[PDB]
């Protein structure tokens, strides 16, 4: 089931529920905990942000790797923006301070 880049989901999680449909394996909550237990904050951050749902992040990472500079443009997961919109739609203002 190997995959590099493919079509993305509604929430913009790129792997699109992997099956016949070309997909990436769910780096679930247990694996996130496992990376947290390690001193991992760069591989975890990249694979929970620039590898999964950050559209600008994903495009920049692809252009960077094909350029040869493996540099992460962090940005922000679009899943968090989806969560903010869903909580706001309930009628609960959740926003960020600059």
């Amino acid at each position: 089931h190997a995959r590099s880049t493919g079509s993305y989901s509604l929430v913009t999680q790129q792997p699109l529920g992997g099956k016949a449909q070309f997909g990436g394996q769910r780096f679930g909550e247990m694996e996130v905990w496992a990376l947290e237990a390690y001193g991992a904050a760069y591989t975890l951050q990249e694979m929970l942000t620039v590898k999964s749902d950050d559209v600008n992040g994903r495009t920049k990472m692809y252009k960077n790797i094909v350029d040869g500079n493996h540099q992460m443009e962090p940005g922000m997961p679009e899943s968090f923006n989806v969560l903010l919109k869903e909580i706001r739609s309930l009628g609960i203002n959740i926003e960020l301070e600059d």
């Binding site: 001193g39 760069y42 040869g68 500079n69 493996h70 540099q71």
Partner: protein, 79 residues
């Protein structure tokens, strides 16, 4: 080639700042035209940075002072 980073972490007793300093070194090697001081053996940047740290000539202090000197002659370039 390398298998373990033990001697590197006895060189840098943090195991976390080591990753940061070697990542800065690899960034200098890739983005910049910086020549690695240890000659490579068909090795990637991320492992040759650890090789540099292993010999003890590259760590946070030397890297910081080196980039500071480069910035100094960057101001001094235009006099």
């Amino acid at each position: 080639a390398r298998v373990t980073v033990q001697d590197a972490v006895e060189k840098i007793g943090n195991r976390f700042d080591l990753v940061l300093v070697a990542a800065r070194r690899a960034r200098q090697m890739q983005v910049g035209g910086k020549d690695p001081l240890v000659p490579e053996e068909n090795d990637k940047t991320t492992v040759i940075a650890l090789r540099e740290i292993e010999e003890g000539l590259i760590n946070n202090q030397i890297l910081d002072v080196r980039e500071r000197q480069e910035q100094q002659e960057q101001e001094a370039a235009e006099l």
